[PDB]
Tab-separated table of C-alpha atoms in Angstrom:
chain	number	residue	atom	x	y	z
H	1	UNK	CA	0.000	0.000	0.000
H	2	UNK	CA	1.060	3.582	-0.298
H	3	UNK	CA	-0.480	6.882	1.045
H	4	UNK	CA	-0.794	9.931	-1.113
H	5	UNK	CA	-2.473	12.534	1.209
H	6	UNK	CA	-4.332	13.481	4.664
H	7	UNK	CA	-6.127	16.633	5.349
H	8	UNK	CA	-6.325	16.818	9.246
H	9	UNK	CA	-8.488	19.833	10.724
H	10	UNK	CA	-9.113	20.811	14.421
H	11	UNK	CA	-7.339	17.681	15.651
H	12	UNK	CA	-5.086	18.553	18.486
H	13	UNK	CA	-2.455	20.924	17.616
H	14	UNK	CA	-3.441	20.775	13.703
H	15	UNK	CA	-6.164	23.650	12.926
H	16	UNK	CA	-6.306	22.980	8.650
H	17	UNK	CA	-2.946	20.433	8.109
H	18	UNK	CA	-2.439	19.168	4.098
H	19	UNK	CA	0.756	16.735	3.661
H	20	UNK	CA	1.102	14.494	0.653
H	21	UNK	CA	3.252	11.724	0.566
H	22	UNK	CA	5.416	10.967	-2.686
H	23	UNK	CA	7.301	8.382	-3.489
H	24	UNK	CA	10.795	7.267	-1.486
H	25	UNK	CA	11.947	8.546	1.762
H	26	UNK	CA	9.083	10.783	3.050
H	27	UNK	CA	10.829	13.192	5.981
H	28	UNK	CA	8.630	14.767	8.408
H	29	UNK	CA	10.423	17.121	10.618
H	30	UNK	CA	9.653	18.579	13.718
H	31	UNK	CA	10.338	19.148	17.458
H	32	UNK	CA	8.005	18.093	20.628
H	33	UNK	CA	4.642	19.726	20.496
H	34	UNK	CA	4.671	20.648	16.327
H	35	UNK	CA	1.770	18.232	15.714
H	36	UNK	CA	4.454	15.596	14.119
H	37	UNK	CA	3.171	13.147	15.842
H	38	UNK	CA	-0.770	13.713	16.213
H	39	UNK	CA	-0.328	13.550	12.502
H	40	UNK	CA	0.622	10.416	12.475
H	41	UNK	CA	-2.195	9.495	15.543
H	42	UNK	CA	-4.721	11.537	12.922
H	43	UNK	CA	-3.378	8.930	9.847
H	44	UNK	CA	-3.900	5.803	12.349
H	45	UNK	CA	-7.699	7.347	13.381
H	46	UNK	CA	-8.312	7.714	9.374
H	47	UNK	CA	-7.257	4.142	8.756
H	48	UNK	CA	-8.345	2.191	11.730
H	49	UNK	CA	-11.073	4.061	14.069
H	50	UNK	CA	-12.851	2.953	16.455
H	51	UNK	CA	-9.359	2.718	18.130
H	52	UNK	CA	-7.626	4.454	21.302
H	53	UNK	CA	-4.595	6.432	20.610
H	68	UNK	CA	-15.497	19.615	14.267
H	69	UNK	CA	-12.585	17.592	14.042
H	70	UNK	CA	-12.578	16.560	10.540
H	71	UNK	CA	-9.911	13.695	8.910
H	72	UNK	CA	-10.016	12.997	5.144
H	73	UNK	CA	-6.999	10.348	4.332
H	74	UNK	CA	-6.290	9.242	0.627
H	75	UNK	CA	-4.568	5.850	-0.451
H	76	UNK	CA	-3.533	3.257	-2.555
H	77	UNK	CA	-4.341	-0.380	-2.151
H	78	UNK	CA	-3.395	-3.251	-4.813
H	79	UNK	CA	-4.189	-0.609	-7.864
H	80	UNK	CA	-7.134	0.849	-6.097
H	81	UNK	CA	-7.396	4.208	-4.957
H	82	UNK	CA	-9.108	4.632	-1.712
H	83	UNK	CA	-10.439	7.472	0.419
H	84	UNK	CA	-11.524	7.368	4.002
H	85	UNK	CA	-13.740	10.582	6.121
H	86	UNK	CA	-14.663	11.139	9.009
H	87	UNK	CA	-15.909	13.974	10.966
H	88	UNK	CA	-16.641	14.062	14.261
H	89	UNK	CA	-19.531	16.382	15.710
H	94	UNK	CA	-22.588	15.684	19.042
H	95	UNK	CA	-22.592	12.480	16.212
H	96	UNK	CA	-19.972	11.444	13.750
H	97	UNK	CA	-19.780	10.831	9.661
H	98	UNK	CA	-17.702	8.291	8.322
H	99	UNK	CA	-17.166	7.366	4.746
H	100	UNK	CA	-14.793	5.479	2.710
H	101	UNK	CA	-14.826	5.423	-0.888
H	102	UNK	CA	-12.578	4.474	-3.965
H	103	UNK	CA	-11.506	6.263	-7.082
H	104	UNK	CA	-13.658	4.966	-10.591
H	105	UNK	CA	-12.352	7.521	-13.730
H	106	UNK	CA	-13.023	10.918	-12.241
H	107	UNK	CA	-15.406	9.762	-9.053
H	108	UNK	CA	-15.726	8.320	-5.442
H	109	UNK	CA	-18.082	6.397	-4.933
H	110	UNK	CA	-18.791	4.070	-1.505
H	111	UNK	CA	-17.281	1.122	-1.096
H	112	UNK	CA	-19.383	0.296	1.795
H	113	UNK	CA	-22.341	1.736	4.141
H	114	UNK	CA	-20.754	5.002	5.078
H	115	UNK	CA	-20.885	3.672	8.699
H	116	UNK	CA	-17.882	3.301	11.621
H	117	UNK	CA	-18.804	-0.502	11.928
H	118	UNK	CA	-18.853	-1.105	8.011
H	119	UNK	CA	-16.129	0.816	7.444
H	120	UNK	CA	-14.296	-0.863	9.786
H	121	UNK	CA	-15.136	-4.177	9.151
H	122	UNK	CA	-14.085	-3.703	5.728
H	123	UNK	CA	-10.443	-2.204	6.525
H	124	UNK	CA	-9.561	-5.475	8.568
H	125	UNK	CA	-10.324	-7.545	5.226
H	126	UNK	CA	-8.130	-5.095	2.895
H	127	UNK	CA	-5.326	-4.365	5.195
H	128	UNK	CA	-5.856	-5.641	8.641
H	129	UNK	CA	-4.669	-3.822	11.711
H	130	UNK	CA	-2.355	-6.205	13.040
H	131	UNK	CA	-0.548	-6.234	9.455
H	132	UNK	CA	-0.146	-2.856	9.448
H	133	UNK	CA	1.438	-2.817	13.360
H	134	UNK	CA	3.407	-5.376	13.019
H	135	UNK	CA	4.960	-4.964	8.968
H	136	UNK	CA	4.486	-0.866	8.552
H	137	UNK	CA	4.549	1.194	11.373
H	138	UNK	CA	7.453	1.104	13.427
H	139	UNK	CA	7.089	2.488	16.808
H	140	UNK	CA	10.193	3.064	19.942
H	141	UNK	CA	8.438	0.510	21.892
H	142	UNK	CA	9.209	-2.042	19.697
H	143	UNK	CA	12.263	-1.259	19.549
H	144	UNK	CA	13.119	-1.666	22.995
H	145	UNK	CA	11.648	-4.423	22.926
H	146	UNK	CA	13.940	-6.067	20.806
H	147	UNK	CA	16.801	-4.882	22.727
M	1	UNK	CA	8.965	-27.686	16.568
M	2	UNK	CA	7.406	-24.981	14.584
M	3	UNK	CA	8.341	-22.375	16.886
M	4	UNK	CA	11.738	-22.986	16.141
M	5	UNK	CA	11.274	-22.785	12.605
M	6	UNK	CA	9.712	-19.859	12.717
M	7	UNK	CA	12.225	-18.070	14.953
M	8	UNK	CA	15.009	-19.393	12.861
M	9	UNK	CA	13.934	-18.228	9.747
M	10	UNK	CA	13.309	-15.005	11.605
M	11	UNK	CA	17.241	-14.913	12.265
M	12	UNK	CA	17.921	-15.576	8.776
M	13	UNK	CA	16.352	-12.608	7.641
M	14	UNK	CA	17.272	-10.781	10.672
M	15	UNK	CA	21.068	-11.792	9.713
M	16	UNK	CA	21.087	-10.823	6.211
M	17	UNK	CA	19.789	-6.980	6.780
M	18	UNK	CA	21.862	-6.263	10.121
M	19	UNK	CA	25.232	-7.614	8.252
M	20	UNK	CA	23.925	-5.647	5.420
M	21	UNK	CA	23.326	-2.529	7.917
M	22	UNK	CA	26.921	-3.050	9.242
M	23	UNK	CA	29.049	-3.857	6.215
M	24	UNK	CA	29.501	-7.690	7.530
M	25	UNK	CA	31.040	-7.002	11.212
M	26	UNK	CA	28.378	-9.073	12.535
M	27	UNK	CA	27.633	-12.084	10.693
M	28	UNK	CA	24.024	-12.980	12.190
M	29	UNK	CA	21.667	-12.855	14.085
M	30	UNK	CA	20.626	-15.154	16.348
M	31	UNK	CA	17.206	-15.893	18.059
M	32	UNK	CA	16.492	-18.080	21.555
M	33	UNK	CA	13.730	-18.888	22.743
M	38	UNK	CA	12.901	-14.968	23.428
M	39	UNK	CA	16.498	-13.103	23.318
M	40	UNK	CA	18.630	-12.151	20.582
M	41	UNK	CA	22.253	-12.435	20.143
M	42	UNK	CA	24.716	-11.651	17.388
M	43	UNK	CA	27.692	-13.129	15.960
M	44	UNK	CA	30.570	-11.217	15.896
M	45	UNK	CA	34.149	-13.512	15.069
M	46	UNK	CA	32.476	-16.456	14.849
M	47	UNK	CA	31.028	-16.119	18.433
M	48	UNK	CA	27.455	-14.867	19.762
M	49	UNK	CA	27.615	-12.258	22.169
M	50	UNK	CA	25.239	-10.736	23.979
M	51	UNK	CA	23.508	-6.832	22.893
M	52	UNK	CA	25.054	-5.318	25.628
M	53	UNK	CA	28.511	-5.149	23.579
M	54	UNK	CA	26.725	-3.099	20.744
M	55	UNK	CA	27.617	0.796	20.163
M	56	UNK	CA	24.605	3.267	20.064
M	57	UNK	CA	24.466	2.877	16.133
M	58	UNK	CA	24.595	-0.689	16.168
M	59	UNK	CA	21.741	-0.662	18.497
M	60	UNK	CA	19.115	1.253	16.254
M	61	UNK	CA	20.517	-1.373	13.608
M	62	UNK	CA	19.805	-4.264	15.172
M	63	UNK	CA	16.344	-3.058	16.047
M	64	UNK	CA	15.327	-1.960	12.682
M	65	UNK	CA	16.850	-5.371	11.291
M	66	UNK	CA	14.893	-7.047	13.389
M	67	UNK	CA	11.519	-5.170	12.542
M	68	UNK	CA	12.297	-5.426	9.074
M	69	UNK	CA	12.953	-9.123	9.422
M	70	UNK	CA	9.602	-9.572	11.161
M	71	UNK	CA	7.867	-7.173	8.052
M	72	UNK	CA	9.180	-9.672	5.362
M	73	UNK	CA	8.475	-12.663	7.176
M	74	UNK	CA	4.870	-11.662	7.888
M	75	UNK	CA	4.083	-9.935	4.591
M	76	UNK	CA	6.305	-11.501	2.336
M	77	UNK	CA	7.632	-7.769	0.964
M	78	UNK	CA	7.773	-4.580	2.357
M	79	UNK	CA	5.617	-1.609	0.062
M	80	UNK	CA	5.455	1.216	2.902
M	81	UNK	CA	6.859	1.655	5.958
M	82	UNK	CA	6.278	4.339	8.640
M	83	UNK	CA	9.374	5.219	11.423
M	84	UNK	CA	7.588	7.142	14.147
M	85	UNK	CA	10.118	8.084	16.004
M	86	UNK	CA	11.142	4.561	16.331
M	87	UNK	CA	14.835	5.796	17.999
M	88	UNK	CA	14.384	9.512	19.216
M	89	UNK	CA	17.891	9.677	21.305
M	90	UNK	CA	19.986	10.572	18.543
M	91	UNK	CA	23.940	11.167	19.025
M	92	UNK	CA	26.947	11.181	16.159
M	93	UNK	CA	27.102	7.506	15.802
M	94	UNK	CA	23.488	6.800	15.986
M	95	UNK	CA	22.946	9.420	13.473
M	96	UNK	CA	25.270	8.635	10.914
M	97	UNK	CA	24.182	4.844	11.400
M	98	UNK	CA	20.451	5.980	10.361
M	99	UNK	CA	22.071	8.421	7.424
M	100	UNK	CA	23.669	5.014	6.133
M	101	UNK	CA	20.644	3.430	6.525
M	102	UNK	CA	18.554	5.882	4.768
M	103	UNK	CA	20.535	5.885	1.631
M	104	UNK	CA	21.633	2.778	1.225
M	105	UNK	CA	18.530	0.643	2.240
M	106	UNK	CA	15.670	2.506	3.057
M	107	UNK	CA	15.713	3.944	-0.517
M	108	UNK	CA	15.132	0.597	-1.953
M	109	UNK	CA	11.723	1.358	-0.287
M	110	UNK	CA	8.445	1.745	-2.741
M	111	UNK	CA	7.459	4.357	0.242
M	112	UNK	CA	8.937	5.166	3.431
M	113	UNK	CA	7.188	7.773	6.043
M	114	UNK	CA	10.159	8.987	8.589
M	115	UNK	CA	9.166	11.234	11.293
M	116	UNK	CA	12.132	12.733	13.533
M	117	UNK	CA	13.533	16.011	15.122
M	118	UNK	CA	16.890	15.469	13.368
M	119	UNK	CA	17.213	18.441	10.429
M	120	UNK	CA	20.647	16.977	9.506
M	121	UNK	CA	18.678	13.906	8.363
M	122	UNK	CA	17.317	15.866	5.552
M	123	UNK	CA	19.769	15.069	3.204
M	124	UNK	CA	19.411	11.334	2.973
M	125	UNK	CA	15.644	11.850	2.219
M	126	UNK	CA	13.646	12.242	-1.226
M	127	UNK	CA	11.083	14.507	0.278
M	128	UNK	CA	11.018	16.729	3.080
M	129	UNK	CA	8.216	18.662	5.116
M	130	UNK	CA	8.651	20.824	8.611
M	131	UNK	CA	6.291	21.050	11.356
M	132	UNK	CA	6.227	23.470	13.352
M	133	UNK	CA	4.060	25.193	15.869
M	134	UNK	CA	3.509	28.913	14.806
M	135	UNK	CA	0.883	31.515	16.629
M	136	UNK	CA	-0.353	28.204	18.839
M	137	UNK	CA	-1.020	25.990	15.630
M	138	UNK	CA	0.816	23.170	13.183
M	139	UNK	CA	2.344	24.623	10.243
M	140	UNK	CA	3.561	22.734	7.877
M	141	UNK	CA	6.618	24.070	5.207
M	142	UNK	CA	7.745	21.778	2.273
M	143	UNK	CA	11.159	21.765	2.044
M	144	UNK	CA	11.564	19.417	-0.664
């Protein structure tokens, strides 16, 4: 898989944040507090919520040739929808609801794939050492 | 025992990348059942006679082991933070690794505080708190 771009908006720190990812080594700099790292949390809550870790997330990725796009908003009340990329429109992939949505995730790239092959996190590291 | 096949073939991938990531001073890496050990002159010796950037090696040989023996190949891959205490030889160890491995990477999401780390990267974005919210600057 491969991510191309998350729009985070009132999420912590992040008030309207854009970053696209390219191909290659994608560096994110920043020191304690920039909103580095709740923009990582905001990628995780676009991919995998319900999960502990208007607020409005709209995340954008690729998936074995199909381009994919999860929203969510949350209120009181939330909006979630996840759609993929025909030609020129999105259109749902499944009811636009948190259980569907998430049901369907753990079939196309389940959560304990992703923690344990993709994200690398210092815990892990020490414990390996 | 298929516990020990599957933390022996673990090792085996685990072996190639960290004598890869330390142009062949170690040899391998070796699993027991569960502490790891490396090979160093034809003996195994325990971590605790690894330098700082032979640490963050052997941890991120290990994770990518455990990535390729899971999935089979590695597309993306997202560093958060994975080794935030960051002195010369840790650094340059994670510069080497950057350019010389990393890079083989379809996609590879690194998030750090290090701005000298900028150089070994293909794209580069800083965040930074300004008037109490993120902003972020594209750098490359």
């Amino acid at each position: 898989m491969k991510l191309e771009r998350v729009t985070v908006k009132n999420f912590r720190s992040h008030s309207d944040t854009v970053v696209e990812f390219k191909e290659g080594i994608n560096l994110i700099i920043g020191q304690n507090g920039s909103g580095k790292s709740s923009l990582l949390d905001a990628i995780l809550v676009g991919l995998y919520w319900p999960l502990r870790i208007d607020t409005y997330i709209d995340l954008i990725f690729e998936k074995d040739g199909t381009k994919y796009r999860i929203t969510r908003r949350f209120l009181s009340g939330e909006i979630h929808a996840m759609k993929r990329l025909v030609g020129n429109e999105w259109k749902h992939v499944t009811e636009p609801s948190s259980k569907a949505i998430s049901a369907f995730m753990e079939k196309l790239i389940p959560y304990n794939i992703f923690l344990n092959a993709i994200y690398i996190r210092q815990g892990q590291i020490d414990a390996i050492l | 025992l298929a516990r020990e096949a599957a933390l022996s073939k673990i090792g085996e991938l685990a072996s190639e990348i960290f004598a890869e990531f330390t142009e062949g001073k170690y040899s391998e890496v070796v699993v027991r059942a569960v502490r790891l050990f490396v090979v160093w002159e034809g003996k195994e010796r325990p971590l605790t006679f690894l330098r700082g950037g032979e640490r963050i090696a052997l941890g991120l040989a290990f994770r990518l082991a455990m990535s390729l023996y899971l999935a089979g190949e590695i597309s993306l891959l997202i560093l958060d933070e994975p080794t935030p205490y960051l002195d010369e030889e840790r650094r340059r160890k994670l510069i080497t690794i950057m350019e010389r491995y990393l890079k083989k990477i379809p996609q590879v999401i690194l998030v750090s505080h290090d701005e000298e780390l900028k150089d070994a990267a293909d794209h580069v974005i800083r965040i930074s708190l300004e008037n109490g919210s993120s902003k972020v600057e594209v750098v490359s």
